[PDB]
Tab-separated table of C-alpha atoms in Angstrom:
chain	number	residue	atom	x	y	z
A	1	UNK	CA	-17.338	0.500	52.353
A	2	UNK	CA	-16.600	3.519	50.065
A	3	UNK	CA	-19.957	3.857	48.353
A	4	UNK	CA	-19.159	7.089	50.142
A	5	UNK	CA	-16.857	8.223	47.324
A	6	UNK	CA	-19.593	7.250	44.864
A	7	UNK	CA	-22.126	9.424	46.683
A	8	UNK	CA	-19.843	12.479	46.565
A	9	UNK	CA	-19.299	12.063	42.838
A	10	UNK	CA	-22.995	11.824	42.104
A	11	UNK	CA	-23.737	14.847	44.290
A	12	UNK	CA	-21.235	17.027	42.506
A	13	UNK	CA	-22.741	16.021	39.151
A	14	UNK	CA	-26.269	16.561	40.483
A	15	UNK	CA	-25.590	19.996	41.838
A	16	UNK	CA	-23.563	21.198	38.888
A	17	UNK	CA	-26.019	19.921	36.292
A	18	UNK	CA	-29.136	21.154	38.015
A	19	UNK	CA	-27.444	24.539	37.917
A	20	UNK	CA	-26.238	24.397	34.356
A	21	UNK	CA	-29.552	23.221	33.011
A	22	UNK	CA	-31.731	25.467	35.157
A	23	UNK	CA	-29.663	28.303	33.700
A	24	UNK	CA	-29.776	27.137	30.096
A	25	UNK	CA	-33.520	26.582	30.183
A	26	UNK	CA	-34.001	30.129	31.500
A	27	UNK	CA	-35.854	28.536	34.399
A	28	UNK	CA	-33.397	30.596	36.454
A	29	UNK	CA	-36.064	32.234	38.689
A	30	UNK	CA	-35.124	35.635	40.161
A	31	UNK	CA	-34.349	34.952	43.883
A	32	UNK	CA	-37.502	35.739	45.913
A	33	UNK	CA	-36.771	37.923	48.970
A	34	UNK	CA	-38.291	39.946	51.785
A	35	UNK	CA	-37.955	43.555	50.514
A	36	UNK	CA	-36.336	44.457	53.855
A	37	UNK	CA	-34.295	41.345	54.562
A	38	UNK	CA	-31.607	42.046	57.155
A	39	UNK	CA	-29.844	38.878	55.947
A	40	UNK	CA	-27.205	38.525	53.281
A	41	UNK	CA	-26.920	35.183	51.433
A	42	UNK	CA	-24.097	33.746	49.302
A	43	UNK	CA	-24.226	31.672	46.142
A	44	UNK	CA	-24.421	28.420	48.108
A	45	UNK	CA	-27.524	29.500	49.965
A	46	UNK	CA	-28.905	31.079	46.813
A	47	UNK	CA	-28.553	27.840	44.862
A	48	UNK	CA	-30.292	26.053	47.739
A	49	UNK	CA	-33.175	28.522	47.854
A	50	UNK	CA	-33.638	28.498	44.098
A	51	UNK	CA	-33.808	24.741	44.477
A	52	UNK	CA	-36.525	24.857	47.077
A	53	UNK	CA	-38.406	27.355	44.925
A	54	UNK	CA	-38.751	24.920	42.067
A	55	UNK	CA	-39.862	22.170	44.438
A	56	UNK	CA	-42.520	24.393	45.942
A	57	UNK	CA	-43.591	25.673	42.523
A	58	UNK	CA	-44.115	22.137	41.250
A	59	UNK	CA	-45.786	21.114	44.499
A	60	UNK	CA	-48.225	23.964	43.797
A	61	UNK	CA	-48.940	22.851	40.248
A	62	UNK	CA	-49.516	19.335	41.585
A	63	UNK	CA	-52.193	20.584	44.034
A	64	UNK	CA	-54.605	22.759	41.984
A	65	UNK	CA	-57.621	22.235	44.294
A	66	UNK	CA	-55.691	23.586	47.267
A	67	UNK	CA	-55.686	27.284	48.199
A	68	UNK	CA	-52.459	29.306	48.065
A	69	UNK	CA	-52.103	29.524	51.898
A	70	UNK	CA	-52.825	25.826	52.530
A	71	UNK	CA	-50.158	25.130	49.899
A	72	UNK	CA	-47.525	27.162	51.768
A	73	UNK	CA	-48.705	25.721	55.056
A	74	UNK	CA	-48.360	22.150	53.857
A	75	UNK	CA	-45.067	22.664	51.978
A	76	UNK	CA	-43.277	24.472	54.830
A	77	UNK	CA	-42.664	21.564	57.201
A	78	UNK	CA	-41.775	19.137	54.395
A	79	UNK	CA	-39.192	21.641	53.252
A	80	UNK	CA	-37.728	22.045	56.772
A	81	UNK	CA	-37.731	18.303	57.268
A	82	UNK	CA	-36.156	17.704	53.858
A	83	UNK	CA	-33.405	20.189	54.511
A	84	UNK	CA	-32.517	18.973	58.007
A	85	UNK	CA	-32.408	15.390	56.687
A	86	UNK	CA	-30.446	16.451	53.610
A	87	UNK	CA	-27.945	18.085	55.947
A	88	UNK	CA	-27.712	14.940	58.114
A	89	UNK	CA	-26.926	12.874	55.064
A	90	UNK	CA	-24.371	15.397	53.747
A	91	UNK	CA	-22.614	15.174	57.116
A	92	UNK	CA	-22.569	11.381	57.188
A	93	UNK	CA	-20.818	11.183	53.791
A	94	UNK	CA	-18.149	13.643	54.949
A	95	UNK	CA	-17.501	11.917	58.258
A	96	UNK	CA	-17.283	8.775	56.149
A	97	UNK	CA	-14.963	10.398	53.611
A	98	UNK	CA	-12.844	11.357	56.627
A	99	UNK	CA	-12.919	14.981	55.486
A	100	UNK	CA	-15.317	16.281	58.179
A	101	UNK	CA	-12.841	18.799	59.663
A	102	UNK	CA	-13.985	21.253	62.368
A	103	UNK	CA	-13.756	24.011	59.698
A	104	UNK	CA	-15.913	22.276	57.139
A	105	UNK	CA	-18.417	21.160	59.819
A	106	UNK	CA	-18.822	24.777	60.867
A	107	UNK	CA	-19.159	26.122	57.350
A	108	UNK	CA	-21.770	23.580	56.362
A	109	UNK	CA	-23.706	24.140	59.575
A	110	UNK	CA	-23.685	27.909	59.052
A	111	UNK	CA	-25.082	27.279	55.604
A	112	UNK	CA	-27.979	25.192	56.902
A	113	UNK	CA	-28.837	27.875	59.444
A	114	UNK	CA	-28.592	30.596	56.818
A	115	UNK	CA	-30.817	28.629	54.457
A	116	UNK	CA	-33.433	27.748	57.028
A	117	UNK	CA	-33.838	31.365	58.089
A	118	UNK	CA	-33.934	32.600	54.489
A	119	UNK	CA	-36.655	30.094	53.685
A	120	UNK	CA	-38.598	31.106	56.781
A	121	UNK	CA	-38.504	34.602	55.377
A	122	UNK	CA	-39.508	33.534	51.913
A	123	UNK	CA	-42.590	31.786	53.335
A	124	UNK	CA	-43.774	35.049	54.800
A	125	UNK	CA	-44.159	36.605	51.340
A	126	UNK	CA	-47.898	37.178	50.826
B	1	UNK	CA	-8.233	25.437	49.041
B	2	UNK	CA	-10.978	25.829	51.660
B	3	UNK	CA	-12.951	27.299	48.715
B	4	UNK	CA	-13.208	23.983	46.878
B	5	UNK	CA	-14.186	21.796	49.876
B	6	UNK	CA	-16.890	24.369	50.551
B	7	UNK	CA	-18.258	24.007	47.011
B	8	UNK	CA	-18.205	20.289	47.824
B	9	UNK	CA	-19.976	20.298	51.134
B	10	UNK	CA	-22.499	22.624	49.539
B	11	UNK	CA	-23.025	20.299	46.621
B	12	UNK	CA	-23.628	17.438	49.042
B	13	UNK	CA	-26.234	19.434	50.966
B	14	UNK	CA	-27.824	20.600	47.761
B	15	UNK	CA	-28.156	17.146	46.175
B	16	UNK	CA	-29.356	15.416	49.351
B	17	UNK	CA	-31.839	18.138	50.244
B	18	UNK	CA	-33.351	18.108	46.781
B	19	UNK	CA	-33.558	14.350	47.125
B	20	UNK	CA	-35.251	14.479	50.488
B	21	UNK	CA	-37.727	17.206	49.675
B	22	UNK	CA	-38.877	15.695	46.400
B	23	UNK	CA	-39.674	12.460	48.212
B	24	UNK	CA	-41.415	14.066	51.171
B	25	UNK	CA	-43.588	16.268	48.894
B	26	UNK	CA	-44.556	13.300	46.646
B	27	UNK	CA	-43.448	14.951	43.435
B	28	UNK	CA	-43.361	11.973	41.060
B	29	UNK	CA	-44.339	10.287	37.781
B	30	UNK	CA	-45.606	6.951	39.197
B	31	UNK	CA	-33.079	0.015	34.314
B	32	UNK	CA	-30.815	2.043	36.706
B	33	UNK	CA	-29.520	2.826	40.233
B	34	UNK	CA	-30.257	5.618	42.718
B	35	UNK	CA	-27.661	8.051	41.395
B	36	UNK	CA	-29.102	8.004	37.884
B	37	UNK	CA	-32.677	7.972	39.177
B	38	UNK	CA	-31.787	11.069	41.163
B	39	UNK	CA	-30.377	12.856	38.097
B	40	UNK	CA	-33.300	11.747	35.962
B	41	UNK	CA	-35.840	12.934	38.446
B	42	UNK	CA	-33.789	16.114	38.453
B	43	UNK	CA	-34.121	16.717	34.727
B	44	UNK	CA	-37.696	15.556	34.497
B	45	UNK	CA	-38.642	18.219	37.047
B	46	UNK	CA	-36.811	20.960	35.189
B	47	UNK	CA	-38.291	19.958	31.841
B	48	UNK	CA	-41.710	19.784	33.490
B	49	UNK	CA	-41.227	23.345	34.600
B	50	UNK	CA	-39.872	24.425	31.182
B	51	UNK	CA	-43.040	22.903	29.725
B	52	UNK	CA	-45.110	25.227	31.897
B	53	UNK	CA	-43.049	28.191	30.712
B	54	UNK	CA	-44.274	27.486	27.209
B	55	UNK	CA	-47.940	26.498	27.459
B	56	UNK	CA	-48.292	27.506	23.786
B	57	UNK	CA	-45.762	24.980	22.314
B	58	UNK	CA	-46.659	21.327	21.550
B	59	UNK	CA	-45.238	18.350	23.503
B	60	UNK	CA	-42.749	17.237	20.809
B	61	UNK	CA	-41.804	20.891	20.287
B	62	UNK	CA	-40.593	21.067	23.909
B	63	UNK	CA	-38.807	17.713	23.881
B	64	UNK	CA	-37.061	18.804	20.680
B	65	UNK	CA	-36.066	21.974	22.463
B	66	UNK	CA	-35.127	20.762	25.941
B	67	UNK	CA	-33.090	17.715	24.974
B	68	UNK	CA	-29.946	19.555	23.760
B	69	UNK	CA	-30.105	21.792	26.814
B	70	UNK	CA	-30.238	18.720	29.050
B	71	UNK	CA	-27.350	17.173	27.106
B	72	UNK	CA	-25.218	20.306	27.264
B	73	UNK	CA	-26.302	20.588	30.871
B	74	UNK	CA	-24.972	17.226	32.004
B	75	UNK	CA	-21.664	17.598	30.153
B	76	UNK	CA	-20.918	20.898	31.739
B	77	UNK	CA	-21.987	19.393	35.069
B	78	UNK	CA	-19.623	16.511	34.522
B	79	UNK	CA	-16.707	18.818	33.712
B	80	UNK	CA	-17.319	20.983	36.772
B	81	UNK	CA	-17.596	17.821	38.873
B	82	UNK	CA	-14.234	16.589	37.588
B	83	UNK	CA	-12.789	19.985	38.388
B	84	UNK	CA	-13.497	19.784	42.088
B	85	UNK	CA	-12.569	16.129	42.288
B	86	UNK	CA	-9.190	17.098	40.835
B	87	UNK	CA	-8.841	20.246	42.979
B	88	UNK	CA	-9.424	18.053	46.052
B	89	UNK	CA	-6.748	15.517	45.009
B	90	UNK	CA	-9.423	12.873	45.264
B	91	UNK	CA	-9.889	11.883	41.569
B	92	UNK	CA	-9.043	8.114	41.604
B	93	UNK	CA	-8.952	6.079	38.404
B	94	UNK	CA	-11.791	4.249	40.182
B	95	UNK	CA	-13.710	7.480	40.914
B	96	UNK	CA	-13.292	8.878	37.387
B	97	UNK	CA	-14.572	5.677	35.827
B	98	UNK	CA	-17.487	5.613	38.258
B	99	UNK	CA	-18.381	9.183	37.373
B	100	UNK	CA	-18.055	8.727	33.601
B	101	UNK	CA	-20.219	5.656	34.167
B	102	UNK	CA	-22.970	7.668	35.750
B	103	UNK	CA	-22.771	10.349	33.055
B	104	UNK	CA	-23.249	7.947	30.158
B	105	UNK	CA	-25.997	5.985	31.841
B	106	UNK	CA	-28.037	8.984	32.839
B	107	UNK	CA	-27.442	10.441	29.442
B	108	UNK	CA	-28.823	7.341	27.755
B	109	UNK	CA	-31.755	6.840	30.087
B	110	UNK	CA	-32.981	10.399	29.422
B	111	UNK	CA	-32.901	9.724	25.705
B	112	UNK	CA	-35.018	6.609	26.220
B	113	UNK	CA	-37.422	8.744	28.229
B	114	UNK	CA	-37.911	11.243	25.411
B	115	UNK	CA	-38.910	8.475	23.035
B	116	UNK	CA	-41.509	7.455	25.652
B	117	UNK	CA	-44.873	9.203	26.352
Protein backbone atom coordinates (compact mmCIF):
# COMPACT_ATOMS: atom_id res chain seq x y z
CA UNK A 1 0.00 0.00 0.00
CA UNK A 2 3.12 2.23 -0.43
CA UNK A 3 1.89 4.54 -3.15
CA UNK A 4 2.83 6.60 -0.13
CA UNK A 5 6.53 6.44 -1.02
CA UNK A 6 5.59 7.38 -4.58
CA UNK A 7 3.73 10.46 -3.37
CA UNK A 8 6.72 11.68 -1.33
CA UNK A 9 9.03 11.31 -4.31
CA UNK A 10 6.75 13.27 -6.60
CA UNK A 11 6.30 16.00 -3.99
CA UNK A 12 10.01 16.50 -3.56
CA UNK A 13 10.42 16.79 -7.34
CA UNK A 14 7.43 19.14 -7.56
CA UNK A 15 8.63 21.46 -4.87
CA UNK A 16 12.24 21.52 -5.96
CA UNK A 17 11.44 22.07 -9.63
CA UNK A 18 8.81 24.72 -9.10
CA UNK A 19 11.52 26.54 -7.18
CA UNK A 20 14.32 26.00 -9.64
CA UNK A 21 12.25 27.03 -12.61
CA UNK A 22 10.48 29.94 -10.95
CA UNK A 23 13.99 31.20 -10.19
CA UNK A 24 15.44 30.58 -13.63
CA UNK A 25 12.53 32.25 -15.38
CA UNK A 26 12.98 35.33 -13.18
CA UNK A 27 9.35 34.86 -12.20
CA UNK A 28 10.80 34.99 -8.68
CA UNK A 29 8.38 37.68 -7.38
CA UNK A 30 9.67 39.82 -4.49
CA UNK A 31 7.81 38.54 -1.36
CA UNK A 32 4.79 40.82 -0.76
CA UNK A 33 4.52 41.96 2.88
CA UNK A 34 2.74 44.27 5.30
CA UNK A 35 5.25 47.13 5.75
CA UNK A 36 4.89 46.70 9.53
CA UNK A 37 4.57 42.93 9.82
CA UNK A 38 5.29 41.78 13.37
CA UNK A 39 5.83 38.28 11.95
CA UNK A 40 9.04 36.69 10.77
CA UNK A 41 8.84 33.93 8.13
CA UNK A 42 11.40 31.31 7.06
CA UNK A 43 12.20 29.93 3.63
CA UNK A 44 9.54 27.22 3.94
CA UNK A 45 6.78 29.73 4.53
CA UNK A 46 8.29 32.05 1.94
CA UNK A 47 8.24 29.34 -0.72
CA UNK A 48 4.61 28.65 0.21
CA UNK A 49 3.60 32.30 -0.01
CA UNK A 50 5.39 32.83 -3.30
CA UNK A 51 3.43 29.82 -4.47
CA UNK A 52 0.10 31.26 -3.47
CA UNK A 53 1.09 34.54 -5.11
CA UNK A 54 1.41 32.96 -8.51
CA UNK A 55 -1.90 31.16 -8.08
CA UNK A 56 -3.66 34.37 -7.16
CA UNK A 57 -1.91 36.29 -9.95
CA UNK A 58 -3.09 33.79 -12.54
CA UNK A 59 -6.55 33.65 -10.98
CA UNK A 60 -6.62 37.43 -11.54
CA UNK A 61 -5.60 37.19 -15.18
CA UNK A 62 -8.28 34.53 -15.65
CA UNK A 63 -11.00 36.89 -14.33
CA UNK A 64 -10.59 40.20 -16.23
CA UNK A 65 -14.24 41.31 -15.84
CA UNK A 66 -13.99 41.09 -12.06
CA UNK A 67 -12.91 44.05 -9.90
CA UNK A 68 -9.69 43.88 -7.86
CA UNK A 69 -11.52 43.57 -4.48
CA UNK A 70 -13.99 40.90 -5.66
CA UNK A 71 -10.93 39.02 -6.93
CA UNK A 72 -9.27 39.04 -3.50
CA UNK A 73 -12.58 38.28 -1.85
CA UNK A 74 -13.21 35.25 -4.03
CA UNK A 75 -9.61 33.94 -3.95
CA UNK A 76 -9.19 34.19 -0.16
CA UNK A 77 -11.36 31.28 0.95
CA UNK A 78 -10.20 29.00 -1.87
CA UNK A 79 -6.66 29.67 -0.76
CA UNK A 80 -7.45 28.90 2.91
CA UNK A 81 -9.36 25.80 1.91
CA UNK A 82 -6.58 24.67 -0.43
CA UNK A 83 -3.95 25.10 2.23
CA UNK A 84 -5.83 23.33 5.02
CA UNK A 85 -6.56 20.43 2.64
CA UNK A 86 -2.98 20.42 1.36
CA UNK A 87 -1.85 20.16 4.97
CA UNK A 88 -4.28 17.29 5.67
CA UNK A 89 -2.89 15.38 2.73
CA UNK A 90 0.74 16.10 3.70
CA UNK A 91 -0.04 14.66 7.14
CA UNK A 92 -1.69 11.52 5.79
CA UNK A 93 1.38 10.62 3.69
CA UNK A 94 3.66 11.03 6.71
CA UNK A 95 1.49 9.00 9.06
CA UNK A 96 1.47 6.46 6.24
CA UNK A 97 5.24 6.66 5.77
CA UNK A 98 5.43 6.02 9.52
CA UNK A 99 7.60 9.12 9.91
CA UNK A 100 4.95 11.34 11.57
CA UNK A 101 6.94 11.88 14.80
CA UNK A 102 5.67 14.34 17.45
CA UNK A 103 8.54 16.67 16.39
CA UNK A 104 7.72 16.67 12.71
CA UNK A 105 3.97 16.97 13.41
CA UNK A 106 4.66 20.09 15.45
CA UNK A 107 7.00 21.65 12.93
CA UNK A 108 4.62 21.12 10.04
CA UNK A 109 1.69 22.44 12.05
CA UNK A 110 3.63 25.56 13.04
CA UNK A 111 4.34 26.10 9.37
CA UNK A 112 0.67 25.93 8.41
CA UNK A 113 -0.21 28.43 11.13
CA UNK A 114 2.63 30.71 10.10
CA UNK A 115 1.55 30.55 6.47
CA UNK A 116 -2.12 31.12 7.12
CA UNK A 117 -1.44 34.23 9.17
CA UNK A 118 1.07 35.57 6.64
CA UNK A 119 -1.47 35.12 3.86
CA UNK A 120 -4.14 36.82 5.94
CA UNK A 121 -1.77 39.74 6.15
CA UNK A 122 -0.97 39.70 2.47
CA UNK A 123 -4.69 39.91 1.65
CA UNK A 124 -4.94 43.14 3.57
CA UNK A 125 -2.57 44.90 1.15
CA UNK A 126 -4.65 47.53 -0.67
CA UNK B 1 19.06 15.51 10.57
CA UNK B 2 15.83 17.19 11.68
CA UNK B 3 16.75 19.74 8.96
CA UNK B 4 16.17 17.31 6.10
CA UNK B 5 12.84 15.85 7.32
CA UNK B 6 11.68 19.44 7.67
CA UNK B 7 12.57 20.19 4.04
CA UNK B 8 10.54 17.05 3.34
CA UNK B 9 7.42 17.81 5.29
CA UNK B 10 7.57 21.27 3.77
CA UNK B 11 7.84 19.89 0.27
CA UNK B 12 4.81 17.70 0.93
CA UNK B 13 2.76 20.67 2.13
CA UNK B 14 3.97 22.78 -0.75
CA UNK B 15 3.14 20.26 -3.49
CA UNK B 16 -0.25 19.28 -2.05
CA UNK B 17 -1.32 22.85 -1.37
CA UNK B 18 -0.43 23.95 -4.87
CA UNK B 19 -2.40 20.96 -6.09
CA UNK B 20 -5.44 21.77 -4.01
CA UNK B 21 -5.53 25.48 -4.72
CA UNK B 22 -5.13 25.14 -8.47
CA UNK B 23 -8.12 22.81 -8.55
CA UNK B 24 -10.32 24.89 -6.27
CA UNK B 25 -9.60 28.10 -8.25
CA UNK B 26 -10.29 26.39 -11.62
CA UNK B 27 -6.98 27.35 -13.16
CA UNK B 28 -6.86 25.05 -16.19
CA UNK B 29 -6.42 24.47 -19.93
CA UNK B 30 -9.55 22.35 -20.57
CA UNK B 31 -1.02 9.92 -21.77
CA UNK B 32 0.09 10.11 -18.07
CA UNK B 33 -0.66 9.75 -14.33
CA UNK B 34 -1.37 12.27 -11.56
CA UNK B 35 2.25 12.88 -10.61
CA UNK B 36 3.21 13.93 -14.13
CA UNK B 37 -0.04 15.84 -14.62
CA UNK B 38 0.80 17.72 -11.45
CA UNK B 39 4.30 18.62 -12.68
CA UNK B 40 2.98 19.53 -16.11
CA UNK B 41 0.31 21.76 -14.73
CA UNK B 42 3.12 23.20 -12.64
CA UNK B 43 5.26 24.16 -15.62
CA UNK B 44 2.38 25.26 -17.78
CA UNK B 45 1.43 27.79 -15.10
CA UNK B 46 4.95 29.13 -14.80
CA UNK B 47 5.38 29.41 -18.57
CA UNK B 48 1.97 31.08 -18.75
CA UNK B 49 3.22 33.64 -16.30
CA UNK B 50 6.58 34.02 -18.11
CA UNK B 51 4.52 34.68 -21.25
CA UNK B 52 2.85 37.59 -19.48
CA UNK B 53 6.25 38.94 -18.46
CA UNK B 54 7.07 39.33 -22.12
CA UNK B 55 3.93 40.58 -23.87
CA UNK B 56 6.21 41.89 -26.66
CA UNK B 57 7.72 38.49 -27.72
CA UNK B 58 5.94 36.06 -30.11
CA UNK B 59 4.54 32.67 -29.01
CA UNK B 60 7.33 30.55 -30.56
CA UNK B 61 9.87 33.05 -29.21
CA UNK B 62 8.74 32.23 -25.65
CA UNK B 63 8.55 28.47 -26.16
CA UNK B 64 12.06 28.61 -27.62
CA UNK B 65 13.12 30.51 -24.54
CA UNK B 66 11.29 28.72 -21.74
CA UNK B 67 11.94 25.14 -22.80
CA UNK B 68 15.63 24.95 -21.75
CA UNK B 69 14.76 26.64 -18.47
CA UNK B 70 12.06 24.03 -17.85
CA UNK B 71 14.52 21.27 -18.77
CA UNK B 72 17.28 22.61 -16.55
CA UNK B 73 14.60 23.18 -13.95
CA UNK B 74 13.43 19.59 -13.71
CA UNK B 75 16.96 18.15 -13.66
CA UNK B 76 18.02 20.31 -10.80
CA UNK B 77 14.73 19.43 -9.10
CA UNK B 78 15.44 15.77 -9.60
CA UNK B 79 18.95 16.07 -8.15
CA UNK B 80 17.72 17.96 -5.09
CA UNK B 81 14.97 15.36 -4.67
CA UNK B 82 17.52 12.54 -4.74
CA UNK B 83 19.55 14.44 -2.18
CA UNK B 84 16.87 14.40 0.47
CA UNK B 85 15.82 10.86 -0.33
CA UNK B 86 19.43 9.84 0.30
CA UNK B 87 19.82 12.06 3.39
CA UNK B 88 16.72 10.36 4.83
CA UNK B 89 18.09 6.84 4.18
CA UNK B 90 14.93 6.18 2.24
CA UNK B 91 16.27 5.91 -1.36
CA UNK B 92 15.20 2.34 -2.38
CA UNK B 93 16.20 0.87 -5.73
CA UNK B 94 12.41 0.84 -6.18
CA UNK B 95 12.05 4.53 -5.20
CA UNK B 96 14.95 5.70 -7.39
CA UNK B 97 13.55 3.92 -10.42
CA UNK B 98 10.10 5.34 -9.71
CA UNK B 99 11.52 8.85 -9.48
CA UNK B 100 13.69 8.57 -12.61
CA UNK B 101 10.52 7.24 -14.23
CA UNK B 102 8.57 10.33 -13.36
CA UNK B 103 11.40 12.62 -14.48
CA UNK B 104 11.67 11.15 -17.96
CA UNK B 105 7.94 10.97 -18.50
CA UNK B 106 7.24 14.51 -17.44
CA UNK B 107 10.21 15.63 -19.42
CA UNK B 108 8.86 14.00 -22.57
CA UNK B 109 5.27 15.08 -22.11
CA UNK B 110 6.33 18.74 -21.85
CA UNK B 111 8.20 18.42 -25.11
CA UNK B 112 5.07 17.04 -26.77
CA UNK B 113 3.17 20.00 -25.36
CA UNK B 114 5.51 22.54 -26.95
CA UNK B 115 4.96 21.02 -30.37
CA UNK B 116 1.21 21.46 -29.72
CA UNK B 117 -0.78 24.75 -29.94
